[PDB]
C-alpha cells in the first residue's frame, strides 16, 4: 500500500464501519465517542482497532492526517477527554486524547446520541 491508499483505507473503514454501526461508539470500552457536533476517536486506540482488522501505527496516522478530515482549531489537531465509567461524568476515569471530525463528515442527518461517558476539555 502507499500513503494515499492506506488514508483512504483507513477512512473507509472508519466512516463505513460507523455509519453501519459496525465499530463500537458512545461506551465505557469504545475509541469512538459523539460529542456536542463532533465525532472523538482516541489514539491511538482507533489506529490499533483499525489494525486488528486489516510505526505500523505511525503510518496509518500520518496517512490519515494528511487528508484532512479531522478538525484544527487554531493549530490544535488534539484534543483532551475524560473517560468516565458511570454515566453523568464521574467516578473512575481515564484521560484520552485523539481527533475530533465533524459529525457531517461521517454520518445522513442520522446518528446516535452523543456519549454518557466522555468529557471534552
Given at each position: 500500500l502507499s500513503s494515499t491508499e492506506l488514508g483512504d483505507l483507513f477512512w473507509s473503514w472508519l466512516r463505513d464501519g460507523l455509519r453501519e454501526g459496525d465499530i463500537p461508539v458512545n461506551?465505557?470500552?469504545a475509541c469512538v465517542h459523539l460529542t456536542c457536533g463532533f465525532v472523538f476517536i482516541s489514539v491511538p486506540g482507533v489506529f490499533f482497532l483499525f489494525l486488528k482488522s486489516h510505526g505500523?501505527?505511525?503510518?496509518?496516522?500520518?496517512?490519515?492526517?494528511?487528508?484532512?478530515?479531522?478538525?484544527?482549531s487554531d493549530s490544535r489537531r488534539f484534543w483532551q477527554c475524560?473517560?468516565?465509567?458511570?454515566?453523568?461524568?464521574?467516578?473512575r476515569y481515564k484521560k484520552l486524547t485523539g481527533y475530533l471530525i465533524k459529525m457531517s463528515e461521517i454520518y445522513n442527518g442520522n446518528f446516535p446520541d452523543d456519549s454518557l461517558f466522555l468529557k471534552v476539555i
Open positions: 461506551t465505557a470500552d505500523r501505527k505511525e503510518q496509518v496516522q500520518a496517512a490519515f492526517e494528511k487528508m484532512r478530515k479531522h478538525r484544527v475524560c473517560l468516565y465509567e458511570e454515566p453523568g461524568g464521574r467516578g
